[PDB]
Amino acid sequence: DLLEIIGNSKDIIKIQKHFRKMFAGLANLTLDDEKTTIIGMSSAEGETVTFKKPISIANGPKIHEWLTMVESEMKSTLATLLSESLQHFNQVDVNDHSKYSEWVDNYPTQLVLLTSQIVWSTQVDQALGGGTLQQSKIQEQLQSIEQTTQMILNNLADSVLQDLSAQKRKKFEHLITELVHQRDVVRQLQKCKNLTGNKDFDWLYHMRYYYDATQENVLHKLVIHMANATFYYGFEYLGIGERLVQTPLTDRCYLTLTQALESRMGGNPFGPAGTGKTETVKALGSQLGRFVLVFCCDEGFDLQAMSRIFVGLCQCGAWGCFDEFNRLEERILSAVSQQIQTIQVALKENSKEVELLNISLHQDMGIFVTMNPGYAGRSNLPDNLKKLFRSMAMIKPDREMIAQVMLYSQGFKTAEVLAGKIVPLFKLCQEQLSAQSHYDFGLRALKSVLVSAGGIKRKCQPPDAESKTKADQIYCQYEIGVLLNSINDTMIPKLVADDIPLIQSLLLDVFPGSQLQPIQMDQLRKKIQEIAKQRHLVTKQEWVEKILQLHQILNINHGVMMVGPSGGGKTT
Amino acid sequence: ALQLHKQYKSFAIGSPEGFELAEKSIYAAAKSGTWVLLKNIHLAPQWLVQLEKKLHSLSPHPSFRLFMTSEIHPALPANLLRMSNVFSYENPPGVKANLLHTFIGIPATRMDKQPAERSRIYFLLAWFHAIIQERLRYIPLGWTKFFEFNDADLRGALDSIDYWVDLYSKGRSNIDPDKIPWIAVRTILGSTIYGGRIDNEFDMRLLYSFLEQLFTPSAFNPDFPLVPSIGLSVPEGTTRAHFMKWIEALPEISTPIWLGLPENAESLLLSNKARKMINDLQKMQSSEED
Ligand SMILES: Nc1ncnc2c1ncn2[C@@H]1O[C@H](COP(=O)(O)OP(=O)(O)O)[C@@H](O)[C@H]1O
Ligand SMILES: Nc1ncnc2c1ncn2[C@@H]1O[C@H](COP(=O)(O)OP(=O)(O)O)[C@@H](O)[C@H]1O
Numbered sequence: 095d096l097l098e099i100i101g102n103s104k105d106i107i108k109i110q111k112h113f114r115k116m117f118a119g120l121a122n123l124t125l126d127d128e129k130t131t132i133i134g135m136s137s138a139e140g141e142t143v144t145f146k147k148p149i150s151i152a153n154g155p156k157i158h159e160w161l162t163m164v165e166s167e168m169k170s171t172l173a174t175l176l177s178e179s180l181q182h183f184n185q186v187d188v189n190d191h192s193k194y195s196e197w198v199d200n201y202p203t204q205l206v207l208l209t210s211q212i213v214w215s216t217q218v219d220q221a222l223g224g225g226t227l228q229q230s231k232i233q234e235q236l237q238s239i240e241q242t243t244q245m246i247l248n249n250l251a252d253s254v255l256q257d258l259s260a261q262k263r264k265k266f267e268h269l270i271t272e273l274v275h276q277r278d279v280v281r282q283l284q285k286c287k288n289l290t291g292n293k294d295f296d297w298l299y300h301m302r303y304y305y306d307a308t309q310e311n312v313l314h315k316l317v318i319h320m321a322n323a324t325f326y327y328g329f330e331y332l333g334i335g336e337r338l339v340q341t342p343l344t345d346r347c348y349l350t351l352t353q354a355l356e357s358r359m360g361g362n363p364f365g366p367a368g369t370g371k372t373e374t375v376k377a378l379g380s381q382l383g384r385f386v387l388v389f390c391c392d393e394g395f396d397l398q399a400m401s402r403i404f405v406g407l408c409q410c411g412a413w414g415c416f417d418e419f420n421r422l423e424e425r426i427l428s429a430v431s432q433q434i435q436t437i438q439v440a441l442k443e444n445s446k447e448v449e450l451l452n453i454s455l456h457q458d459m460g461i462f463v464t465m466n467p468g469y470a471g472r473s474n475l476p477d478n479l480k481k482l483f484r485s486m487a488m489i490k491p492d493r494e495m496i497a498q499v500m501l502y503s504q505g506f507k508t509a510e511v512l513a514g515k516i517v518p519l520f521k522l523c524q525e526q527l528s529a530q531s532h533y534d535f536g537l538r539a540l541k542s543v544l545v546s547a548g549g550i551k552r553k554c555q556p557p558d559a560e561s562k563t564k565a566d567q568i569y570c571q572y573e574i575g576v577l578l579n580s581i582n583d584t585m586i587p588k589l590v591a592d593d594i595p596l597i598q599s600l601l602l603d604v605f606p607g608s609q610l611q612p613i614q615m616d617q618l619r620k621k622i623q624e625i626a627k628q629r630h631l632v633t634k635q636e637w638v639e640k641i642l643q644l645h646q647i648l649n650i651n652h653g654v655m656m657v658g659p660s661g662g663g664k665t666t
Numbered sequence: 667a668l669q670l671h672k673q674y675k676s677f678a679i680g681s682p683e684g685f686e687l688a689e690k691s692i693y694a695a696a697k698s699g700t701w702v703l704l705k706n707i708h709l710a711p712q713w714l715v716q717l718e719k720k721l722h723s724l725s726p727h728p729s730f731r732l733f734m735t736s737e738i739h740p741a742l743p744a745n746l747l748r749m750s751n752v753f754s755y756e757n758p759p760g761v762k763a764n765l766l767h768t769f770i771g772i773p774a775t776r777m778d779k780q781p782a783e784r785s786r787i788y789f790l791l792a793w794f795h796a797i798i799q800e801r802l803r804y805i806p807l808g809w810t811k812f813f814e815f816n817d818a819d820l821r822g823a824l825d826s827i828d829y830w831v832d833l834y835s836k837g838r839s840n841i842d843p844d845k846i847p848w849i850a851v852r853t854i855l856g857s858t859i860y861g862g863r864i865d866n867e868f869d870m871r872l873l874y875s876f877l878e879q880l881f882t883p884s885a886f887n888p889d890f891p892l893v894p895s896i897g898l899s900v901p902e903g904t905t906r907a908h909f910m911k912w913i914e915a916l917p918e919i920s921t922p923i924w925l926g927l928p929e930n931a932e933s934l935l936l937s938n939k940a941r942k943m944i945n946d947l948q949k950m951q952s953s954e955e956d
């Protein structure tokens with residue numbers, strides 16, 4: 095691939111594909127009509143950032159030369175652009191959602207979130223003060239901040255309802271997620287009476303972001319703090335990608351990993367499958383603007399490709415995250431484990447060079463390994479890495495809270511309740527329905543129904559003291575309905591016959607005054623019965639229903655698996 | 667190897683390169699008559715089968731000595747153990763023995779530097795480390811599972827202490843125990859260093875129990891109790907030597923009361939060992955019959 099790249103050095107259109115392999119979020123460079131100079135960079139989701147200093151690929155520069163330059167304008171442009179966004183937001187009427195939303199668009203998803211966290215940090219710092227402000231006061235400062243955001247959230251809480259791009263949609267969804275973290279943290283701070291101020295650990299515990307313009311280098315302008323560890327933003331373009339819900343397990347994990355990086359030790363989150371392990375290491379790297387590479391171990395693993403990759407991990411100072419590490423052939427486990435040991439002993443010592451199989455060692459690099467827990471409290475890491483890693487236990491992800499924020503960003507206004515109901519629901523189906531090997535009631539699955547509920551809510555239309563009450567109740571049941579709609583669309587179709595009365599019954603317990611609706615494909619139903627008579631097929635209600643589940647699902651996933659015992663009606 | 671004075675040659679088993687250079691340097695090491703050392707050969711379960719067969723019919727010279735190293739791991743073939751003089755290594759019991767092992771890694775050079783309160787803090791760290799590790803021999807009373815609080819945790823905890831002491835007193839001969847952010851100290855050590863590995867919500871409850879007991883300002887007050895029932899309290903001192911002389915005067919035997927557990931915790935332990943033994947004698951007596 096390097097060769098292909100080199101040769102087609104000037105015929106860029108041909109290299110594009112390989113970018114997803116050298117940059118976290120940069121997927122394609124935007125060229126000029128003549129295709130002779132790079133004007134910017136595109137993300138996989140379609141977002142675009144035009145560089146401040148255009149780069150020419152004709153003027154002379156060879157392959158590495160001009161790529162080394164894009165890498166710089168990437169960082170350069172984003173850093174500069176962050177300042178401009180700080181200056182923009184710095185002057186904007188939070189309530190005027192117009193000029194506000196007007197600002198979210200002038201900048202990359204990546205920066206809008208930082209510009210948001212930089213402010214919040216600084217605002218909270220002032221509220222707490224220099225440790226000389228009667229509680230009551232600081233407490234007022236927080237209500238202010240705590241309330242202000244909750245406002246901004248509502249607006250955004252309505253925007254995601256309005257029709258807009260998948261690009262812009264994921265950007266607000268992201269901001270709805272970060273903003274819930276901001277208020278949630280402040281809320282904590284509000285339950286805190288005796289506060290020391292800008293320095294009370296109830297606040298230094300969290301990750302805060304400080305921008306100090308009165309600093310030479312644009313890169314070195316943003317500095318991230320968490321507890322007592324300090325980081326420089328790497329300014330690697332991430333595109334829109336994903337954001338996790340900063341759940342309390344997440345922040346507890348950020349604290350252990352940042353402390354490990356700060357101690358020049360590796361990260362080792364462990365726990366069962368589906369708890370948010372690899373995903374969290376990915377959100378942290380994205381938070382400090384790093385390039386995070388995840389390596390899948392449960393597969394044919396290339397040792398030879400690893401050697402080559404450790405070299406670039408060390409040279410770029412990028413992050414290597416080995417997923418399900420121990421699910422690796424004992425021989426390769428020792429191979430890689432021995433290489434990690436030489437790099438990690440190198441980091442600990444602080445050397446600027448590594449002796450692997452001398453090379454330069456970027457101080458910002460980091461190795462992370464995830465796996466299931468060991469025997470009775472013991473770690474599954476290999477002896478040689480045990481005293482070189484800081485482990486973090488991730489056994490119970492905060493499902494309720496993930497579901498909740500996850501829905502709020504989808505538009506739902508009763509997300510607190512809905513999440514308190516859809517989570518015990520999944521827990522029940524998981525243990526009170528046939529044990530078919532294909533049922534999946536994990537987080538990922540739980541999120542699919544929430545994201546679908548979202549789309550579905552975009553296609554639906556909602557309907558003295560005693561008044562508000564009726565009114566709330568109505569709107570309330572309205573969203574409950576939207577959630578059941580996704581329950582029927584993506585859940586019961588995979589369920590096997592005997593497990594449909596069980597689910598429908600359960601669903602009733604959790605959503606008392608609301609019941610499953612019949613599918614309204616009035617058109618298709620007729621056509622299907624039009625063909626059924628021709629083919630001699632007895633058109634049965636439970637049978638036509640399945641075809642409609644197929645047509646439904648096919649309008650979503652491009653890959654479907656019709657399943658069941660022989661002569662069950664699949665083919666027909 | 668140093669002490670004795672003889673060509674020495676180590677090697678860590680696990681790599682591809684590791685296997686060959688070894689079945690050579692060692693082979694040669696034999697006729698010459700020098701020493702060799704493989705470490706963690708257990709990582710090569712499908713390898714010693716060979717090293718065994720070889721070493722067996724590998725007549726050497728008197729002065730030779732092939733020192734291997736391992737962890738009680740079932741991959742080791744019998745023949746390998748049977749053809750050598752096995753030597754077993756176990757962390758002896760007791761808080762006093764625990765403290766001495768910890769101190770080998772706390773050089774007077776690091777511990778004795780200002781503030782004078784630095785040393786007292788290092789001692790509290792060491793005593794903490796001893797308590798949570800001695801309670802490991804009382805599972806499930808001491809802890810719910812076997813958490814591997816290792817020596818690196820201590821080092822890391824010292825790095826953390828050192829950070830805060832250098833922030834609030836860097837250059838001074840004394841630090842104020844109340845100006846220090848103890849909640850910050852306890853949290854880094856509890857949730858990040860020693861407690862990251864805990865997956866239970868009550869074992870975390872227990873670790874902070876000890877953290878909050880030993881890392882608070884009042885712990886610097888003279889005559890701070892560690893084990894009241896026995897009259898043992900923290901010693902006044904500002905140098906490693908002051909603290910070592912206190913350690914060395916402790917009984918070799920510690921009782922669960924030292925660890926915040928009832929004494930009868932020892933009864934369960936002494937019984938489980940009585941069962942393990944009776945159970946063992948019964949095996950080596952069954953076959954002898956069958
Ligand atoms: N804090 C979080 N916010 C949002 N989603 C999460 C969070 N934690 C986990 N998830 C979701 O749950 C799934 C967890 O799987 P993942 O972490 O990738 O596997 P593992 O936990 O086995 O490493 C992810 O697909 C992710 O979408
Ligand atoms: N709606 C229907 N009414 C009456 N008979 C049907 C209907 N659907 C299928 N059949 C008959 O039942 C059999 C079902 O087999 P089919 O579903 O095609 O295979 P599979 O279930 O292995 O995919 C067919 O041979 C067909 O003749």
Ligand SMILES: [Mg+2]
Nearest residue numbers: 661664665666
């Ligand atoms: Mg068929």
